[PDB]
Write a protein that binds this ligand. Structure first.
Ligand SMILES: [Zn+2]
Ligand SMILES: [Zn+2]
Ligand SMILES: [Zn+2]
Ligand SMILES: [Zn+2]
Lengths: 49, 133, 587
């Protein structure tokens, strides 16, 4: 059982680390997109008023 | 020559109808918003697809207006004016906003109001489709 | 998702039990987690018993049960002990080098900011620790001030005395110095502001004096809301390393050594010889004169002056119009002084308060009144400039920055911040002993005080300062200073020489000065509202024998404002029995 469950604990730890990296990268690129979006918006704006 | 600004057009539509199709036998209500169970939407979408080849092809399309993102002038499409479905107006519109979240940010970057409101006028002699910007 | 503020290893956790959500490397996070009940932990997500209904928070008892951190009630068969191994389970579960200087961090992670040792440590840790300490400090002080009165304005009397009422059960404002409220004028449906206004105590009755920036007016109904803000994370250090150059690296001395500048010219050379210059300044003793002398000394550089508010920059812009012509100067106002171009760091000279200054980079900026400076702002500057030169002006011996939460105990002026700290390690690099203000009467004795006579008897002997032996019938009703027999003794001690009918009355509390101007007929000034300001004959009443009245530095910077003469009615005895003005009696 020790050499049993321990395998499960380990593999599941690892998959958790994976998915967590993934969530992080997702939100970070969300930040980048919001930035680029607003800046394009304003560079479009200040040529019309 | 309809003055460029007149987008509404109703009593026209209804007047044409009352001079020509008078003795028709079910009510007609221009702006299809007022229609009931879709079938009334058909029976008025026709008459509009007819009365709309008499009005001018500029006053068709989005209806922009200027708002203020925290004291900053914008132009956004607050409605629409199809060739059939009469006039249609947004229902959750809101001027004077400070910081705008992801949702409305998105829904602003995809409206052509901002895009074409700031671009070089165009004129193309290769098609016939009414160019714009 | 960055370097742990305790170990510099890169990580992704946040002690949601502290207010500033820093990053902690798995090791150091483990340490602080146990070290108090700092028990929540924020990585990517809430480390909580996300097990429905359960909500218990601390990590130790938390249990990764499958894809959700569990307690015990819900924890599945195979589960996981998060907080264990002496190392929290979090991203990069290896590369957390850990640290030991954590205890300090933990007490800081929890301090009250009230007694000395609090600030002793806040100013004595390391860089990043003190950075974040100050951040948290300001968090405390601000969020402390949120639930107080909105000043709905009525009786907009005179050009000073809005009189004011309030929203009944909510106002708790003191009134001297500057206490900023932002005025909202009652407009159609929403609310538009009016400007920031700081208010005094004010003579006579409810006639509350005011003051602020913004060239607007006031209206009946113009309700002032007690201002509200949110502190912002610093970055650049309080103090960047010093390097004394082998040249005036980048600067070109001067083709003319002006007399007013010449004594300071002596300094104006070696200032380019090091990245930045540290200076003790005898109060106003050509301080602005020193800076403008260095300006015309290096007429080539974009020379920027910054201070606390527009009030220390008052005399500064004055000295600008003096010798810095209106061309090569920019004067900047937020939303006071804009005599030059509003907003142009593209300027030979740029005059500002640190708050109205954004990020910049040029050559030399003066960084002044450091007795009121904080390592918070000592970073804000480096967090806004990379200019070729800074310069550091002021003796820690002058006043404090108003440590309003420094309650029981005081503070050593050094500890007022690391410059002040280091300015009591390294003292001055350069100095303005040139008492370009007071005669020898004040100068010699008040130099014997604490400067230890380092002020040359500057000019000549005025002597028209009177240390009048008072006892002390001083009162403070609710929060307003009043002292009817010292009111009337400063009165009559003016009377048996009437023609003195010229002086402003000066008080530790312009409430004492308020009711004085209510019995005197004389204008008002705080002992605080002092530097730059200076009247020929100035009166001060030792009033209450408090530290806000009787120290060395408070009435030291309010004692070098004696251009010719002072009166002082001393309920207090030491400086009476030590300092050597003309000794006078008691009508
Ligand atoms: Zn219909
Ligand atoms: Zn903590
Ligand atoms: Zn760490
Ligand atoms: Zn549970």
């Amino acid at each position: 059982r020790d050499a049993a469950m321990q395998r499960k604990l380990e593999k599941m730890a690892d998959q958790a680390m994976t998915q967590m990296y993934k969530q992080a990268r997702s939100e970070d690129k969300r930040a980048k997109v919001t930035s680029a979006m607003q800046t394009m918006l304003f560079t479009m704006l200040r040529k019309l008023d | 020559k309809w003055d460029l600004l007149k987008y509404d057009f109703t009593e026209e539509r209804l007047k044409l109808f009352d001079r020509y199709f008078k003795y028709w036998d079910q009510t007609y209500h221009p702006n299809c918003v007022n229609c009931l169970d879709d079938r009334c939407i058909l029976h008025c979408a026709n008459f509009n697809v007819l009365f709309s080849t008499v009005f001018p092809p500029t006053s068709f399309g989005p209806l922009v207006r200027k708002i203020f993102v925290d004291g900053v002038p914008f132009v956004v499409s607050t409605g629409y004016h199809f060739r059939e479905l009469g006039v249609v107006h947004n229902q959750d519109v809101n001027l004077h906003s400070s910081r705008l979240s992801f949702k409305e940010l998105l829904v602003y970057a995809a409206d052509p109001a901002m895009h074409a409101a700031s671009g070089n006028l165009l004129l193309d002699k290769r098609t016939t489709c009414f160019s714009v910007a | 998702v960055g370097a742990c503020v305790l170990c510099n290893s890169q990580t992704s956790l946040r002690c949601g039990a502290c207010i500033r959500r820093p990053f902690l490397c798995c090791k150091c996070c483990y340490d602080h987690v146990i070290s108090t009940s700092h028990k929540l932990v924020l990585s990517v997500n809430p480390y909580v018993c996300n097990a429905p209904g359960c909500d218990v928070t601390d990590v130790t008892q938390l249990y990764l049960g499958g894809m959700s951190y569990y307690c015990k009630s819900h924890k599945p068969p195979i589960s996981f002990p998060l907080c264990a191994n002496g190392q929290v389970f979090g991203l990069y579960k290896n590369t957390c080098v850990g640290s030991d200087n954590v205890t300090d961090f933990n007490a800081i992670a929890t301090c009250d900011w009230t007694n000395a040792g609090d600030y002793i440590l806040a100013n004595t840790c390391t860089e990043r620790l003190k950075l974040f300490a100050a951040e948290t400090l300001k968090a405390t002080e601000e969020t402390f001030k949120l639930s107080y009165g909105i000043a709905t304005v009525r009786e907009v009397l005179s050009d000073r005395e809005l009189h004011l009422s309030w929203e009944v059960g909510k106002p708790r404002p003191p009134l001297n110095r500057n206490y900023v409220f932002t005025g909202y004028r009652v407009t159609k449906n929403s609310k538009v502001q009016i400007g920031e206004y700081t208010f005094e105590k004010g003579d006579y009755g409810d006639a509350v004096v005011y003051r602020g920036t913004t060239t607007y007016k006031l209206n009946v109904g113009d309700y002032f809301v007690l201002t509200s803000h949110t502190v912002m994370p610093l970055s650049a250090p309080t103090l960047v390393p010093q390097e004394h150059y082998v040249r005036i690296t980048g600067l070109y001395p001067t083709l003319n050594i002006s007399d007013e500048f010449s004594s300071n010219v002596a300094n104006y050379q070696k200032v380019g010889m090091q990245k930045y210059s540290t200076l003790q300044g005898p109060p106003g003793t050509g301080k602005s004169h020193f800076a403008i002398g260095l300006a015309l000394y290096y007429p080539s550089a974009r020379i920027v002056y910054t201070a606390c508010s527009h009030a220390a920059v008052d005399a500064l812009c004055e000295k600008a119009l003096k010798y810095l012509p209106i061309d090569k100067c920019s004067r900047i106002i937020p939303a006071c002084f804009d005599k030059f171009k509003v907003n142009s760091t593209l300027e030979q000279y740029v005059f500002c308060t640190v708050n109205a200054l954004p990020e910049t980079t040029a050559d030399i900026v003066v960084f002044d009144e450091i007795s009121m400076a904080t390592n918070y702002d000592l970073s804000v500057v480096n967090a806004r400039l990379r200019a070729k030169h800074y310069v550091y002006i002021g003796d820690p011996a002058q006043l404090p920055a108003p440590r309003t939460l420094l309650t029981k105990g005081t503070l050593e002026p050094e500890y007022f911040n690391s410059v002040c700290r280091l300015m009591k390690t390294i003292g001055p690099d350069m100095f303005l002993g040139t008492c370009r203000r007071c005669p020898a009467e004040i100068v010699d004795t008040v130099s014997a005080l604490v400067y230890d006579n380092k002020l040359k008897a500057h000019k000549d002997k005025s002597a028209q300062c009177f240390k009048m032996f008072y006892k002390g019938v001083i009162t403070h009703d609710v929060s307003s200073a009043i002292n009817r027999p010292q009111i009337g003794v400063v009165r009559e001690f003016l009377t048996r020489n009437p023609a003195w009918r010229k002086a402003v009355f000066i008080s530790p509390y312009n409430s004492q000065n308020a009711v004085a101007s209510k019995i005197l007929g004389l204008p008002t000034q705080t002992v605080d509202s002092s530097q730059g300001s200076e009247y020929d004959y100035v009166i001060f009443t030792q009033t209450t024998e408090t530290a806000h009245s009787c120290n060395v530095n408070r009435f030291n910077v309010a004692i070098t404002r004696a251009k010719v003469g002072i009166l002082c009615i001393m309920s207090d005895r030491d400086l009476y029995d030590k300092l050597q003005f003309t000794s006078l009696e008691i009508p």
